[PDB]
Amino acid sequence: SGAIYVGNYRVVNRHLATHNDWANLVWEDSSRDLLVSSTTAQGCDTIARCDCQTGVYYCSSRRKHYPVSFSKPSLIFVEASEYYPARYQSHLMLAVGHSEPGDCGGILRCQHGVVGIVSTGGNGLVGFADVRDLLWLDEE
Ligand SMILES: CC1=NN(c2ccccc2)C(=O)C1
Ligand SMILES: [Zn+2]
């Protein structure tokens, strides 16, 4: 579980979005596993605006923060899970690391801010859904 709170936006894994998220939807993309909803409170996370390929992510299933190298966001095939069938996920960054389903929502961060959220796992890789291309998250 986990979310990005930036301005009046909540960024969550699409597959973990709640009733309230869908009732307050701003934007969602299944191919990216992202959903943004609106919030009453003004959050403080800052989105990274960079092409960093190094960061630290939080892994709930190890209660650990891991420094990682990750690939630039790309179109990646991802085997079937409990929420999606085997399919190409877009804007996905891979790293060597630990990722179980409940690790989804863990944040990947660089010195510039939030890079993305855990979205995929298995075969010793962790996949993060990039948010650095969503410029509109910084305004309105
Ligand atoms: C929210 C959270 N952000 N993080 C975090 C902290 C440092 C680097 C990357 C991610 C947590 O462990 C929980
Ligand atoms: Zn960065």
Side-chain angles (χ1 to χ4, degrees), residues 3-18 20-30 32-39 47 117 130-131 134-140:
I4 312 167
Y5 300 96
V6 54
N8 286 273
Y9 298 126
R10 165 174 141 104
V11 187
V12 294
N13 299 89
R14 194 178 179 277
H15 75 272
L16 300 178
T18 69
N20 185 78
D21 290 315
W22 289 105
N24 294 293
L25 181 65
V26 173
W27 171 85
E28 53 80 14
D29 184 334
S30 181
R32 294 182 69 157
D33 184 40
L34 287 178
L35 182 143
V36 181
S37 60
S38 48
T39 66
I47 312 307
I117 50 167
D130 182 53
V131 298
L134 305 174
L135 298 198
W136 57 263
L137 280 176
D138 295 326
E139 76 210 343
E140 124 75 9

mmCIF file of all heavy atoms in Angstrom, residues 3-18 20-30 32-39 47 117 130-131 134-140:
data_model
loop_
_atom_site.group_PDB
_atom_site.id
_atom_site.type_symbol
_atom_site.label_atom_id
_atom_site.label_comp_id
_atom_site.label_asym_id
_atom_site.label_seq_id
_atom_site.Cartn_x
_atom_site.Cartn_y
_atom_site.Cartn_z
ATOM 1 N N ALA A 3 0.746 5.959 -1.170
ATOM 2 C CA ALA A 3 0.308 7.024 -2.097
ATOM 3 C C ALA A 3 1.322 8.167 -2.129
ATOM 4 O O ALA A 3 2.098 8.323 -1.163
ATOM 5 C CB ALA A 3 -1.043 7.541 -1.678
ATOM 6 N N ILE A 4 1.286 8.933 -3.218
ATOM 7 C CA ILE A 4 1.937 10.261 -3.304
ATOM 8 C C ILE A 4 0.888 11.335 -3.032
ATOM 9 O O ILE A 4 -0.156 11.345 -3.721
ATOM 10 C CB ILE A 4 2.615 10.471 -4.660
ATOM 11 C CG1 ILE A 4 3.476 9.270 -5.053
ATOM 12 C CG2 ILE A 4 3.400 11.782 -4.657
ATOM 13 C CD1 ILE A 4 3.927 9.262 -6.519
ATOM 14 N N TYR A 5 1.176 12.220 -2.072
ATOM 15 C CA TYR A 5 0.344 13.406 -1.753
ATOM 16 C C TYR A 5 1.090 14.660 -2.203
ATOM 17 O O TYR A 5 1.958 15.126 -1.457
ATOM 18 C CB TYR A 5 -0.037 13.420 -0.279
ATOM 19 C CG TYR A 5 -0.831 12.217 0.139
ATOM 20 C CD1 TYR A 5 -0.203 11.119 0.711
ATOM 21 C CD2 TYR A 5 -2.200 12.146 -0.089
ATOM 22 C CE1 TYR A 5 -0.916 9.992 1.081
ATOM 23 C CE2 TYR A 5 -2.930 11.034 0.287
ATOM 24 C CZ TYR A 5 -2.287 9.952 0.875
ATOM 25 O OH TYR A 5 -2.990 8.842 1.243
ATOM 26 N N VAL A 6 0.736 15.190 -3.375
ATOM 27 C CA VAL A 6 1.341 16.412 -3.984
ATOM 28 C C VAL A 6 0.207 17.397 -4.275
ATOM 29 O O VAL A 6 -0.764 17.020 -5.002
ATOM 30 C CB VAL A 6 2.187 16.112 -5.241
ATOM 31 C CG1 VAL A 6 1.427 15.323 -6.304
ATOM 32 C CG2 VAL A 6 2.762 17.381 -5.841
ATOM 33 N N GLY A 7 0.335 18.626 -3.761
ATOM 34 C CA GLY A 7 -0.724 19.644 -3.851
ATOM 35 C C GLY A 7 -2.042 19.049 -3.401
ATOM 36 O O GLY A 7 -2.074 18.487 -2.305
ATOM 37 N N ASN A 8 -3.078 19.145 -4.242
ATOM 38 C CA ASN A 8 -4.427 18.596 -3.952
ATOM 39 C C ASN A 8 -4.639 17.336 -4.808
ATOM 40 O O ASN A 8 -5.777 17.073 -5.248
ATOM 41 C CB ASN A 8 -5.503 19.677 -4.123
ATOM 42 C CG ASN A 8 -5.491 20.678 -2.984
ATOM 43 O OD1 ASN A 8 -6.124 20.475 -1.949
ATOM 44 N ND2 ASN A 8 -4.712 21.732 -3.139
ATOM 45 N N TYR A 9 -3.591 16.541 -4.979
ATOM 46 C CA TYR A 9 -3.626 15.244 -5.698
ATOM 47 C C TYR A 9 -3.143 14.107 -4.799
ATOM 48 O O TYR A 9 -2.199 14.281 -4.000
ATOM 49 C CB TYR A 9 -2.761 15.325 -6.957
ATOM 50 C CG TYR A 9 -3.228 16.354 -7.954
ATOM 51 C CD1 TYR A 9 -2.384 17.350 -8.437
ATOM 52 C CD2 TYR A 9 -4.521 16.307 -8.451
ATOM 53 C CE1 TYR A 9 -2.811 18.262 -9.387
ATOM 54 C CE2 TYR A 9 -4.972 17.226 -9.381
ATOM 55 C CZ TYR A 9 -4.111 18.195 -9.862
ATOM 56 O OH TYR A 9 -4.559 19.098 -10.769
ATOM 57 N N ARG A 10 -3.803 12.961 -4.928
ATOM 58 C CA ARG A 10 -3.394 11.669 -4.326
ATOM 59 C C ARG A 10 -3.100 10.711 -5.481
ATOM 60 O O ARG A 10 -3.966 10.484 -6.360
ATOM 61 C CB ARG A 10 -4.473 11.146 -3.372
ATOM 62 C CG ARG A 10 -4.306 9.680 -3.008
ATOM 63 C CD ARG A 10 -5.304 9.246 -1.960
ATOM 64 N NE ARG A 10 -5.820 7.909 -2.204
ATOM 65 C CZ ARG A 10 -5.463 6.803 -1.548
ATOM 66 N NH1 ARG A 10 -4.537 6.841 -0.604
ATOM 67 N NH2 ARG A 10 -6.035 5.647 -1.853
ATOM 68 N N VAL A 11 -1.875 10.217 -5.536
ATOM 69 C CA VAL A 11 -1.438 9.296 -6.619
ATOM 70 C C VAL A 11 -1.357 7.914 -5.988
ATOM 71 O O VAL A 11 -0.592 7.765 -5.042
ATOM 72 C CB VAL A 11 -0.096 9.696 -7.236
ATOM 73 C CG1 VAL A 11 0.233 8.845 -8.449
ATOM 74 C CG2 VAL A 11 -0.051 11.182 -7.579
ATOM 75 N N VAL A 12 -2.099 6.953 -6.527
ATOM 76 C CA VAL A 12 -2.147 5.566 -6.008
ATOM 77 C C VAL A 12 -1.995 4.598 -7.175
ATOM 78 O O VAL A 12 -2.109 5.018 -8.359
ATOM 79 C CB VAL A 12 -3.406 5.286 -5.169
ATOM 80 C CG1 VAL A 12 -3.368 6.130 -3.911
ATOM 81 C CG2 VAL A 12 -4.709 5.495 -5.943
ATOM 82 N N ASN A 13 -1.659 3.352 -6.869
ATOM 83 C CA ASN A 13 -1.753 2.265 -7.882
ATOM 84 C C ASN A 13 -3.222 2.181 -8.292
ATOM 85 O O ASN A 13 -4.081 2.160 -7.408
ATOM 86 C CB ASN A 13 -1.270 0.903 -7.387
ATOM 87 C CG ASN A 13 0.183 0.915 -6.969
ATOM 88 O OD1 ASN A 13 0.524 1.194 -5.808
ATOM 89 N ND2 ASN A 13 1.033 0.585 -7.919
ATOM 90 N N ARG A 14 -3.498 2.164 -9.584
ATOM 91 C CA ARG A 14 -4.894 2.050 -10.094
ATOM 92 C C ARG A 14 -5.590 0.857 -9.426
ATOM 93 O O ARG A 14 -6.748 1.003 -8.965
ATOM 94 C CB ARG A 14 -4.926 1.937 -11.615
ATOM 95 C CG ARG A 14 -6.318 2.161 -12.178
ATOM 96 C CD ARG A 14 -6.245 2.070 -13.675
ATOM 97 N NE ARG A 14 -7.498 2.243 -14.423
ATOM 98 C CZ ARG A 14 -8.395 1.281 -14.647
ATOM 99 N NH1 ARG A 14 -8.277 0.080 -14.102
ATOM 100 N NH2 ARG A 14 -9.459 1.541 -15.392
ATOM 101 N N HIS A 15 -4.889 -0.270 -9.310
ATOM 102 C CA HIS A 15 -5.478 -1.536 -8.823
ATOM 103 C C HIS A 15 -5.748 -1.442 -7.327
ATOM 104 O O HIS A 15 -6.443 -2.340 -6.858
ATOM 105 C CB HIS A 15 -4.630 -2.743 -9.262
ATOM 106 C CG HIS A 15 -3.365 -2.906 -8.505
ATOM 107 N ND1 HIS A 15 -2.210 -2.293 -8.892
ATOM 108 C CD2 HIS A 15 -3.051 -3.660 -7.428
ATOM 109 C CE1 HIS A 15 -1.236 -2.634 -8.075
ATOM 110 N NE2 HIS A 15 -1.717 -3.464 -7.165
ATOM 111 N N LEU A 16 -5.255 -0.428 -6.597
ATOM 112 C CA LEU A 16 -5.534 -0.288 -5.141
ATOM 113 C C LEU A 16 -6.460 0.908 -4.881
ATOM 114 O O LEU A 16 -6.731 1.200 -3.694
ATOM 115 C CB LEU A 16 -4.208 -0.189 -4.374
ATOM 116 C CG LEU A 16 -3.290 -1.397 -4.539
ATOM 117 C CD1 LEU A 16 -1.976 -1.205 -3.782
ATOM 118 C CD2 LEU A 16 -3.996 -2.687 -4.092
ATOM 119 N N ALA A 17 -6.950 1.585 -5.931
ATOM 120 C CA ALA A 17 -7.797 2.788 -5.770
ATOM 121 C C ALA A 17 -9.079 2.350 -5.066
ATOM 122 O O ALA A 17 -9.550 1.229 -5.368
ATOM 123 C CB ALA A 17 -8.066 3.449 -7.096
ATOM 124 N N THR A 18 -9.569 3.180 -4.149
ATOM 125 C CA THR A 18 -10.776 2.929 -3.319
ATOM 126 C C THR A 18 -12.004 3.548 -3.999
ATOM 127 O O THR A 18 -11.837 4.310 -4.989
ATOM 128 C CB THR A 18 -10.636 3.509 -1.906
ATOM 129 O OG1 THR A 18 -10.641 4.932 -1.991
ATOM 130 C CG2 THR A 18 -9.381 3.064 -1.189
ATOM 131 N N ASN A 20 -13.697 6.067 -2.799
ATOM 132 C CA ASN A 20 -13.492 7.533 -2.684
ATOM 133 C C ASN A 20 -12.558 8.026 -3.801
ATOM 134 O O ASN A 20 -12.805 9.123 -4.353
ATOM 135 C CB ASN A 20 -12.987 7.896 -1.288
ATOM 136 C CG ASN A 20 -12.888 9.390 -1.083
ATOM 137 O OD1 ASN A 20 -13.899 10.067 -0.858
ATOM 138 N ND2 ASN A 20 -11.678 9.910 -1.182
ATOM 139 N N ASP A 21 -11.503 7.269 -4.128
ATOM 140 C CA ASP A 21 -10.597 7.641 -5.240
ATOM 141 C C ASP A 21 -11.390 7.745 -6.540
ATOM 142 O O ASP A 21 -11.167 8.747 -7.280
ATOM 143 C CB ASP A 21 -9.471 6.636 -5.448
ATOM 144 C CG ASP A 21 -8.459 6.675 -4.323
ATOM 145 O OD1 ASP A 21 -8.083 7.789 -3.929
ATOM 146 O OD2 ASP A 21 -8.059 5.591 -3.877
ATOM 147 N N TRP A 22 -12.225 6.735 -6.838
ATOM 148 C CA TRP A 22 -13.045 6.701 -8.071
ATOM 149 C C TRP A 22 -14.101 7.818 -8.011
ATOM 150 O O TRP A 22 -14.339 8.416 -9.066
ATOM 151 C CB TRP A 22 -13.638 5.307 -8.325
ATOM 152 C CG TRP A 22 -12.628 4.288 -8.754
ATOM 153 C CD1 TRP A 22 -12.094 3.279 -8.015
ATOM 154 C CD2 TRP A 22 -11.986 4.208 -10.040
ATOM 155 N NE1 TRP A 22 -11.187 2.581 -8.758
ATOM 156 C CE2 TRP A 22 -11.086 3.129 -9.998
ATOM 157 C CE3 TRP A 22 -12.091 4.945 -11.215
ATOM 158 C CZ2 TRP A 22 -10.332 2.742 -11.102
ATOM 159 C CZ3 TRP A 22 -11.356 4.565 -12.309
ATOM 160 C CH2 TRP A 22 -10.443 3.513 -12.234
ATOM 161 N N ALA A 23 -14.630 8.141 -6.821
ATOM 162 C CA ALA A 23 -15.630 9.231 -6.614
ATOM 163 C C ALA A 23 -14.984 10.623 -6.764
ATOM 164 O O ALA A 23 -15.736 11.633 -6.851
ATOM 165 C CB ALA A 23 -16.285 9.101 -5.268
ATOM 166 N N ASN A 24 -13.653 10.703 -6.766
ATOM 167 C CA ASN A 24 -12.905 11.984 -6.799
ATOM 168 C C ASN A 24 -11.790 11.887 -7.839
ATOM 169 O O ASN A 24 -10.711 12.507 -7.645
ATOM 170 C CB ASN A 24 -12.410 12.338 -5.404
ATOM 171 C CG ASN A 24 -13.583 12.623 -4.502
ATOM 172 O OD1 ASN A 24 -14.277 13.611 -4.698
ATOM 173 N ND2 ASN A 24 -13.837 11.737 -3.563
ATOM 174 N N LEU A 25 -12.082 11.199 -8.942
ATOM 175 C CA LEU A 25 -11.073 10.876 -9.977
ATOM 176 C C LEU A 25 -10.633 12.142 -10.711
ATOM 177 O O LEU A 25 -11.489 12.914 -11.151
ATOM 178 C CB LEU A 25 -11.673 9.888 -10.975
ATOM 179 C CG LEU A 25 -10.716 9.450 -12.076
ATOM 180 C CD1 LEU A 25 -9.560 8.653 -11.483
ATOM 181 C CD2 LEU A 25 -11.433 8.621 -13.129
ATOM 182 N N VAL A 26 -9.330 12.275 -10.940
ATOM 183 C CA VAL A 26 -8.750 13.313 -11.826
ATOM 184 C C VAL A 26 -8.305 12.613 -13.106
ATOM 185 O O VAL A 26 -8.567 13.096 -14.194
ATOM 186 C CB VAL A 26 -7.597 14.040 -11.103
ATOM 187 C CG1 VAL A 26 -6.850 14.992 -12.021
ATOM 188 C CG2 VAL A 26 -8.105 14.740 -9.856
ATOM 189 N N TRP A 27 -7.588 11.511 -12.978
ATOM 190 C CA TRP A 27 -6.952 10.881 -14.150
ATOM 191 C C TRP A 27 -6.583 9.457 -13.774
ATOM 192 O O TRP A 27 -6.116 9.255 -12.663
ATOM 193 C CB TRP A 27 -5.736 11.689 -14.598
ATOM 194 C CG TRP A 27 -4.902 11.017 -15.645
ATOM 195 C CD1 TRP A 27 -5.097 11.036 -16.997
ATOM 196 C CD2 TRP A 27 -3.716 10.223 -15.423
ATOM 197 N NE1 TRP A 27 -4.096 10.339 -17.632
ATOM 198 C CE2 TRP A 27 -3.244 9.811 -16.688
ATOM 199 C CE3 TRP A 27 -3.010 9.839 -14.283
ATOM 200 C CZ2 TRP A 27 -2.102 9.024 -16.843
ATOM 201 C CZ3 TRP A 27 -1.870 9.076 -14.435
ATOM 202 C CH2 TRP A 27 -1.432 8.671 -15.694
ATOM 203 N N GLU A 28 -6.768 8.520 -14.691
ATOM 204 C CA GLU A 28 -6.319 7.114 -14.494
ATOM 205 C C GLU A 28 -5.881 6.538 -15.830
ATOM 206 O O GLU A 28 -6.396 6.972 -16.847
ATOM 207 C CB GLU A 28 -7.398 6.273 -13.828
ATOM 208 C CG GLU A 28 -8.747 6.339 -14.533
ATOM 209 C CD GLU A 28 -8.891 5.462 -15.762
ATOM 210 O OE1 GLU A 28 -8.045 4.554 -15.996
ATOM 211 O OE2 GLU A 28 -9.848 5.703 -16.514
ATOM 212 N N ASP A 29 -4.884 5.657 -15.799
ATOM 213 C CA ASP A 29 -4.390 4.931 -16.988
ATOM 214 C C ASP A 29 -4.089 3.498 -16.565
ATOM 215 O O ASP A 29 -3.135 3.289 -15.740
ATOM 216 C CB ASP A 29 -3.212 5.673 -17.605
ATOM 217 C CG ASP A 29 -2.662 5.094 -18.878
ATOM 218 O OD1 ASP A 29 -2.803 3.898 -19.079
ATOM 219 O OD2 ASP A 29 -2.018 5.866 -19.625
ATOM 220 N N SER A 30 -4.843 2.542 -17.113
ATOM 221 C CA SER A 30 -4.699 1.107 -16.768
ATOM 222 C C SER A 30 -3.318 0.626 -17.220
ATOM 223 O O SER A 30 -2.663 -0.122 -16.458
ATOM 224 C CB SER A 30 -5.809 0.288 -17.381
ATOM 225 O OG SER A 30 -5.667 -1.073 -17.033
ATOM 226 N N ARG A 32 -0.645 2.064 -17.255
ATOM 227 C CA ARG A 32 0.422 2.593 -16.350
ATOM 228 C C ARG A 32 0.236 2.141 -14.902
ATOM 229 O O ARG A 32 1.152 2.445 -14.078
ATOM 230 C CB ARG A 32 0.442 4.123 -16.371
ATOM 231 C CG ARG A 32 0.849 4.703 -17.717
ATOM 232 C CD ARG A 32 0.926 6.217 -17.731
ATOM 233 N NE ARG A 32 2.041 6.721 -16.937
ATOM 234 C CZ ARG A 32 2.626 7.904 -17.081
ATOM 235 N NH1 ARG A 32 2.191 8.770 -17.985
ATOM 236 N NH2 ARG A 32 3.647 8.216 -16.311
ATOM 237 N N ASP A 33 -0.901 1.517 -14.578
ATOM 238 C CA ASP A 33 -1.351 1.186 -13.207
ATOM 239 C C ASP A 33 -1.341 2.441 -12.324
ATOM 240 O O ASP A 33 -0.969 2.314 -11.141
ATOM 241 C CB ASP A 33 -0.444 0.100 -12.605
ATOM 242 C CG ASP A 33 -0.860 -0.411 -11.235
ATOM 243 O OD1 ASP A 33 -2.061 -0.577 -11.013
ATOM 244 O OD2 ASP A 33 0.066 -0.605 -10.371
ATOM 245 N N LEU A 34 -1.775 3.598 -12.838
ATOM 246 C CA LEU A 34 -1.833 4.827 -12.008
ATOM 247 C C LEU A 34 -3.248 5.374 -11.972
ATOM 248 O O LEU A 34 -3.979 5.296 -12.989
ATOM 249 C CB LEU A 34 -0.907 5.904 -12.562
ATOM 250 C CG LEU A 34 0.583 5.683 -12.374
ATOM 251 C CD1 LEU A 34 1.327 6.837 -13.037
ATOM 252 C CD2 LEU A 34 0.959 5.559 -10.906
ATOM 253 N N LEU A 35 -3.582 5.933 -10.828
ATOM 254 C CA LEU A 35 -4.815 6.707 -10.642
ATOM 255 C C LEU A 35 -4.461 7.921 -9.795
ATOM 256 O O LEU A 35 -3.654 7.796 -8.840
ATOM 257 C CB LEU A 35 -5.866 5.842 -9.943
ATOM 258 C CG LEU A 35 -7.207 6.521 -9.728
ATOM 259 C CD1 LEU A 35 -8.339 5.521 -9.919
ATOM 260 C CD2 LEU A 35 -7.278 7.169 -8.359
ATOM 261 N N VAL A 36 -5.007 9.071 -10.177
ATOM 262 C CA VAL A 36 -4.928 10.285 -9.328
ATOM 263 C C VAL A 36 -6.343 10.695 -8.943
ATOM 264 O O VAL A 36 -7.203 10.730 -9.827
ATOM 265 C CB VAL A 36 -4.201 11.404 -10.080
ATOM 266 C CG1 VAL A 36 -4.108 12.633 -9.208
ATOM 267 C CG2 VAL A 36 -2.822 10.986 -10.594
ATOM 268 N N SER A 37 -6.549 10.997 -7.666
ATOM 269 C CA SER A 37 -7.807 11.553 -7.143
ATOM 270 C C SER A 37 -7.496 12.905 -6.497
ATOM 271 O O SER A 37 -6.305 13.196 -6.251
ATOM 272 C CB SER A 37 -8.427 10.575 -6.164
ATOM 273 O OG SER A 37 -7.550 10.317 -5.081
ATOM 274 N N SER A 38 -8.538 13.682 -6.200
ATOM 275 C CA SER A 38 -8.422 15.014 -5.555
ATOM 276 C C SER A 38 -8.543 14.862 -4.046
ATOM 277 O O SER A 38 -9.222 13.942 -3.595
ATOM 278 C CB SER A 38 -9.464 15.954 -6.114
ATOM 279 O OG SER A 38 -10.725 15.319 -6.126
ATOM 280 N N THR A 39 -7.893 15.742 -3.292
ATOM 281 C CA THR A 39 -7.845 15.688 -1.818
ATOM 282 C C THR A 39 -8.289 17.056 -1.302
ATOM 283 O O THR A 39 -8.032 18.035 -2.009
ATOM 284 C CB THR A 39 -6.423 15.343 -1.362
ATOM 285 O OG1 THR A 39 -5.621 16.455 -1.744
ATOM 286 C CG2 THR A 39 -5.886 14.082 -2.006
ATOM 287 N N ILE A 47 7.273 16.175 -6.830
ATOM 288 C CA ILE A 47 7.597 15.201 -7.906
ATOM 289 C C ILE A 47 8.966 15.568 -8.480
ATOM 290 O O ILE A 47 9.223 16.718 -8.768
ATOM 291 C CB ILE A 47 6.588 15.128 -9.060
ATOM 292 C CG1 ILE A 47 5.158 15.015 -8.574
ATOM 293 C CG2 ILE A 47 6.860 13.986 -10.014
ATOM 294 C CD1 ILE A 47 4.906 13.894 -7.594
ATOM 295 N N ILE A 117 6.197 4.902 -8.051
ATOM 296 C CA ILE A 117 5.660 4.003 -6.987
ATOM 297 C C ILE A 117 5.834 2.565 -7.478
ATOM 298 O O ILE A 117 5.655 2.294 -8.680
ATOM 299 C CB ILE A 117 4.209 4.325 -6.582
ATOM 300 C CG1 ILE A 117 3.266 4.444 -7.781
ATOM 301 C CG2 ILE A 117 4.168 5.557 -5.691
ATOM 302 C CD1 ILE A 117 1.811 4.455 -7.381
ATOM 303 N N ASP A 130 6.464 5.285 -13.306
ATOM 304 C CA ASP A 130 7.034 6.650 -13.363
ATOM 305 C C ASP A 130 5.909 7.668 -13.192
ATOM 306 O O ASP A 130 4.800 7.451 -13.764
ATOM 307 C CB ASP A 130 7.776 6.896 -14.672
ATOM 308 C CG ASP A 130 8.400 8.276 -14.696
ATOM 309 O OD1 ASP A 130 9.126 8.599 -13.755
ATOM 310 O OD2 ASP A 130 8.144 9.025 -15.655
ATOM 311 N N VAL A 131 6.173 8.757 -12.477
ATOM 312 C CA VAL A 131 5.238 9.915 -12.407
ATOM 313 C C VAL A 131 5.952 11.200 -12.887
ATOM 314 O O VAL A 131 5.310 12.242 -12.877
ATOM 315 C CB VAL A 131 4.641 10.099 -10.995
ATOM 316 C CG1 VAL A 131 3.804 8.900 -10.553
ATOM 317 C CG2 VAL A 131 5.703 10.395 -9.934
ATOM 318 N N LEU A 134 4.369 13.572 -15.525
ATOM 319 C CA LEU A 134 3.015 14.159 -15.263
ATOM 320 C C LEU A 134 3.162 15.573 -14.692
ATOM 321 O O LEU A 134 2.978 15.779 -13.463
ATOM 322 C CB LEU A 134 2.219 13.252 -14.320
ATOM 323 C CG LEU A 134 2.075 11.809 -14.791
ATOM 324 C CD1 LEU A 134 1.385 10.972 -13.708
ATOM 325 C CD2 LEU A 134 1.308 11.727 -16.108
ATOM 326 N N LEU A 135 3.447 16.553 -15.556
ATOM 327 C CA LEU A 135 3.865 17.912 -15.142
ATOM 328 C C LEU A 135 2.705 18.569 -14.408
ATOM 329 O O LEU A 135 2.925 19.263 -13.397
ATOM 330 C CB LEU A 135 4.265 18.710 -16.388
ATOM 331 C CG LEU A 135 5.442 18.185 -17.197
ATOM 332 C CD1 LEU A 135 5.976 19.292 -18.100
ATOM 333 C CD2 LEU A 135 6.571 17.662 -16.325
ATOM 334 N N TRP A 136 1.485 18.247 -14.849
ATOM 335 C CA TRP A 136 0.250 18.845 -14.295
ATOM 336 C C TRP A 136 0.115 18.538 -12.801
ATOM 337 O O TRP A 136 -0.662 19.236 -12.136
ATOM 338 C CB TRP A 136 -0.974 18.422 -15.139
ATOM 339 C CG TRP A 136 -1.182 16.944 -15.279
ATOM 340 C CD1 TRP A 136 -0.793 16.134 -16.307
ATOM 341 C CD2 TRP A 136 -1.796 16.093 -14.304
ATOM 342 N NE1 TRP A 136 -1.171 14.844 -16.054
ATOM 343 C CE2 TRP A 136 -1.770 14.790 -14.825
ATOM 344 C CE3 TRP A 136 -2.389 16.322 -13.063
ATOM 345 C CZ2 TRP A 136 -2.327 13.715 -14.137
ATOM 346 C CZ3 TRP A 136 -2.933 15.256 -12.380
ATOM 347 C CH2 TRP A 136 -2.900 13.970 -12.916
ATOM 348 N N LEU A 137 0.817 17.532 -12.261
ATOM 349 C CA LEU A 137 0.779 17.226 -10.798
ATOM 350 C C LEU A 137 1.328 18.401 -9.957
ATOM 351 O O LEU A 137 0.954 18.470 -8.791
ATOM 352 C CB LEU A 137 1.593 15.965 -10.505
ATOM 353 C CG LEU A 137 0.898 14.640 -10.788
ATOM 354 C CD1 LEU A 137 1.864 13.494 -10.551
ATOM 355 C CD2 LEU A 137 -0.336 14.484 -9.899
ATOM 356 N N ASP A 138 2.159 19.277 -10.534
ATOM 357 C CA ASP A 138 2.780 20.459 -9.859
ATOM 358 C C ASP A 138 1.916 21.722 -9.890
ATOM 359 O O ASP A 138 2.413 22.744 -9.384
ATOM 360 C CB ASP A 138 4.055 20.927 -10.550
ATOM 361 C CG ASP A 138 5.167 19.918 -10.501
ATOM 362 O OD1 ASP A 138 5.247 19.199 -9.485
ATOM 363 O OD2 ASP A 138 5.925 19.849 -11.491
ATOM 364 N N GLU A 139 0.715 21.695 -10.477
ATOM 365 C CA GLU A 139 -0.098 22.928 -10.681
ATOM 366 C C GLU A 139 -1.599 22.613 -10.712
ATOM 367 O O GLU A 139 -1.969 21.473 -11.074
ATOM 368 C CB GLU A 139 0.338 23.617 -11.975
ATOM 369 C CG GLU A 139 -0.165 22.926 -13.229
ATOM 370 C CD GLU A 139 0.719 23.062 -14.457
ATOM 371 O OE1 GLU A 139 1.590 23.949 -14.464
ATOM 372 O OE2 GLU A 139 0.524 22.280 -15.412
ATOM 373 N N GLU A 140 -2.419 23.614 -10.369
ATOM 374 C CA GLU A 140 -3.904 23.593 -10.496
ATOM 375 C C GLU A 140 -4.468 22.472 -9.617
ATOM 376 O O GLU A 140 -5.463 22.678 -8.924
ATOM 377 C CB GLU A 140 -4.292 23.473 -11.975
ATOM 378 C CG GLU A 140 -5.185 22.286 -12.319
ATOM 379 C CD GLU A 140 -6.650 22.394 -11.924
ATOM 380 O OE1 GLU A 140 -7.081 23.493 -11.509
ATOM 381 O OE2 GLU A 140 -7.360 21.375 -12.040
#
